[PDB]
Symmetry: C10
C-alpha cells in the first residue's frame, strides 16, 4: 500500500493492532510508521499517508476502545515520573536550565530537603 | 472543481460530510483538504480554495449543527488529556522546557506527589 | 472597479452584503477581498483598495447596524471556545508552549482535574 | 499642493473634514493621507508632509473640537471589543501566543467558564 | 544660520515661538526642526545643531515658562487617552501582543467587563 | 544484527540485561547503544534501530519489572542531589545564571544562611 | 588644547562653567563636549580627552558645589515628568511596548481611570 | 588502553582511585580524563571512552561507597559558598546581570543591609 | 615601565595615589590607566599590566585604607542618585525600556504621584 | 615546568603561596597563572596545566587551610559592597538595565528614599 487509502483494513489487521497499541501507550507518530510499516516513508507525502491511516473509522473506534480500556496506572505512576525526571537530569543534551528545574522538582517531590 | 466556487454542493455531498466531521472533531484545515480532495493543492492559491469552501452557507449551517450536537465528552475527557500530555512527554522533538512543564502538569493532575 | 473609488455603491450592493456579513462574523480582511472580489489583488496597492472600500459611509452604517444587531451568542458560546482550543491543540504547527498552555486552559475550564 | 505648506486651508476644506473625521475615529495616519490625498506619497519626505498638515492651527482646533464632541460609546462599546478580540482570534497571522491570550480574555469577559 | 550658533535670537523670534509651543505640546525633536527650519538637516551634524539650539538661555527660560503655564488638562485628559489607545489598537503595524495589551487596558478603564 | 529486527531475543540475552539495567538506572539512550552494541551506529537510521529494540515485548516486560523492583533510594537520595548540584556548580560550561541558581538552591537546602 | 591635559584651568574658565552647568542639569557627556569645545572630537581618543577633563580637581570641586546647591525642584517636578512621559508617548520611534507602558503610567499618575 | 574496554581493572587501580576521588569532590568529567589519563583524548570517540569507564561495576561500587562516606561539610560549608559567590563577583567574564545577582545574594546572606 | 612588574613602587608614588583615589571614588579600571599612565596601552597584554599593578601589596594596603576611610556620604547621597537617574533619562542612547523604568523610579522616590 | 606535572612542589614553594593567597582572596583563575607564572600560557592546553596545578594535594590542603583561616570580614564588608555596586554604576560598558538595577539596590541599601 504505497497509495493513500483509508479503507484497506481486514486484510492487514495484525499490523494495525501493533500500531494502535504503540500509539495508545503514548509514543509519537511518524516513527511508529517507520517501525511497523518499514521504510515506506517519503513514498509521496509521508504526513499525508500517516494522517490518512490516522483517519480510518476502524482505527478511530479501536483506538478509542483501547484508550478507554487502559487504567490510569499503566500511563503515569510515581516511579515512572521519577525515572523520567532522572532521565532528563542525566542527559547531557538538555541544556542547563532544564536540568536545574528537573533537580528542583525531584527535590520537591521526594521530601528530600535535607531529610 | 479546480476553480474557486462556493456553491457547487448537492452534487458532492458525501465528501462534504467527511470534511465537516473531521473538522468538527478538531483536526486542522489545510491537510483535511489533502485527505478528502486528493492532491488538488497548489491548483491556484490553496488557501483561497480552502477558505472558499470554508464559506459555504451549506457548510456553515451543517458545521454549526454538528458542532452543537456533539456532547462535551467526545472532545475532552480526562483520559484523552492524560494521553495528550504523555504524547508530549515521550516525543523527542518538543524541546526540553515543554517536556518539563508537561511532567509538572501530569504530576499536578493525578495527585502523584509521592503518593 | 480597478480604481480606488469609495462611492460606487447601489450598483454592486449584493456583493457588499456578503463582505459585511463575512467581516461581522469576525474573519480577517485581505482574504475576504479575494473571496468576494476575485483576484483583483495587486491591481495597485491592495491595502489601499481594501481600506478605501473599508471607509464607505454606506459600509460604515450597514456594518455598525449588522454588528449591533447580532446577539452575543453567535460570536462566542462555550462550545465554540472548546472547539477553538481543541483546534489549537491538534495542530502540529503551533509550537509546543502554546499547545501546553491550550491543554492547561482546557483543563481549567471543564473541571477535568482528574474528575 | 506637492510642497510642505501648513496654511493653505479655506480652499480645500471638505477634504480636511474627511481627514479629521477618519483620524478622530481612530485609524492611523500615513494611509489616511493615501486615501484622501491620492498617491501624492513619496513626493518629498512623506512623513514631512504628513506631520506638516498635522500641525495646522485650523487642524488642531477642529480636531480638538470633534474629539471632545464624540461620546465615549462610539469609540469603545462592549460589542466592538468582542468583535476585535474575535478578529484577532480568527486571523491566521497573529502568532499563537496572542491567539491563546485572546481566547483567555474572551473567556474571562463573557463569564463563559463552562457556564 | 547653517552654523552651530546658540545666541542669534531676537532676530528670528517668531520661529522660536512655534518651536517652543510644538515642543511643549510634547511632539519629539528632530522633526520639528524639519518643520520650522525647512530642510537644513544634514548641514553638518544635525544632532549638533538641534541640541545647540536646544541650549539657548532664551530657549530654556521661555520653554520653562510656557511649560509651567500649561494646565494639566491640555496634555492628558481621559478622552485623549482613549483616543491614543484606540489608535494603537487599529494600527496594523503594532505587532500583536501590544494590540492585545491595548485592548486589555481599554477594557479595564471603561468598566466594559460585559457591562 | 545490522537489520531492524524486534524479536531476535533469547540468543543475545546477557547483552539485553546490561542495557535494561543501564537504562533503568536513568542514563540516556543513544549512547548506551554505543556502549553495549559497539559502533553499529549509522548502520541505517540509528534512531530506527534504537527504538526498534526499545519496543520488544521482552524488553518492555523486563524493563517494567526491574523498574518497579528498584527502591526509591537508589535513584534519588539527598547526598546524590548535593553531588549533582555541586557538579553543576564546578563545571565551567554551564553558563552563569545556571551556576547562580545552583548556588541558590544549595544554599536553600542545607540551611546554610550564615548558619 | 588638542592634548589630554587635566590642569590648564584659570585660563579657560568661562567655558568650564557652561560645561559644569549643562552637566549638572543632567544632559549626557560626549555631546556637551561638541557643544562647548567645538568639533575637537576624534583628535586622539575622544573618550580619553572627555574623561581627562572630567577628572580635574577644579572640575570636581565646582561640580560638587553646584550639584549640592541646586534644589530638588529644578531637576524633577511633576509637570516635567508629565512632559517626559508625553514625549515618549508621541515619539514614533520608541517601539510599541514602551509606548503602552508610558500610557499606563500616565494613566496611573493623574487619576484618569475614567474620572 | 586506547580501546573502549570496561573490565581492565585490578591492573590500573591507583589511577582509578584518583579519578574516583576527583569526581566525588564534584569536578566535571571530560577534563579529569585529561588529567589522569594524559592526552589520550580524541583516540576514537572521547565521550565513548569516558562513559565506558564511567560504567564499570568496580567504578560504580567504589564511587557509591566513597560518595556515601563523605560528610556533608566537605562539599558545601558556608565559607565555600561565600568564596564561590565572590569568585563569580570578581570575574570580568560573567556578564553583568549575573554579577548583580551575586552581589544581591551576598547581601542577603551576611545580613549586610547597612549593618 | 613597559614590563609587567609588581614591585617598582616608592619611585613612582604620586602617580599611584592618583590611581588609588580615582579608583576608590568608583570609576572603572582600564581607562584610569590611560589617564594616569598615558597611552602605554597595548604594550603587551593591557589587562595583564593592569591587573599586575592591581596586585601590589602597597596598592592593596593603601586602597583598603583609603576605601575604609571614606564616609558613606561621598559615594551615595540622595542628590547624586537623582542626578544619575536624570542622566539616564535624558540620554538618547539608553533604549526606551530603561528610560521608562528610570522615570518610574524617579516617580517613586520623590513622592511625585501628582503631588 | 612547561609540562603538566602535579607533584613538583617543595622546589617552587613561594610562588605557590602567592597563587594560593590571590585565589583565596577571590580573583579568578586563568589570569593569576599569567601573573605568577609569566607568559607560559598556550604551552600546550592552558586549561590542562591550570587545572593540573589546581589538583595538587599540597595545593588542596594549603588552600583549604588558608580559606578556613580568613574571617568573613576581609571578603564581604558593607563598604566593599557599596564600592562594587558603585563600580558597576559608573562603568559605561555594563548595559543599561544592569546600571538601573544597581542604582535600585544602592537605593534600597542605604535608606536613601529621599531621606
Amino acid at each position: 500500500q504505497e497509495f493513500a487509502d483509508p479503507h484497506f483494513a481486514a486484510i492487514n489487521q495484525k499490523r494495525f493492532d501493533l500500531y494502535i497499541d504503540l500509539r495508545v501507550q503514548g509514543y509519537s507518530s511518524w516513527r511508529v510508521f517507520r517501525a511497523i510499516w518499514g521504510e515506506e516513508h517519503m513514498d509521496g507525502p509521508a504526513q499525508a499517508r500517516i494522517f490518512a491511516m490516522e483517519s480510518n473509522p476502524y482505527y478511530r473506534k479501536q483506538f478509542k476502545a483501547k484508550l478507554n480500556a487502559t487504567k490510569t496506572s499503566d500511563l503515569w505512576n510515581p516511579k515512572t515520573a521519577l525515572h523520567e525526571l532522572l532521565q532528563m537530569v542525566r542527559d547531557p543534551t538538555v541544556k542547563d536550565s532544564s536540568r536545574l528545574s528537573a533537580i528542583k522538582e525531584l527535590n520537591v517531590l521526594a521530601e528530600i530537603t535535607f531529610v
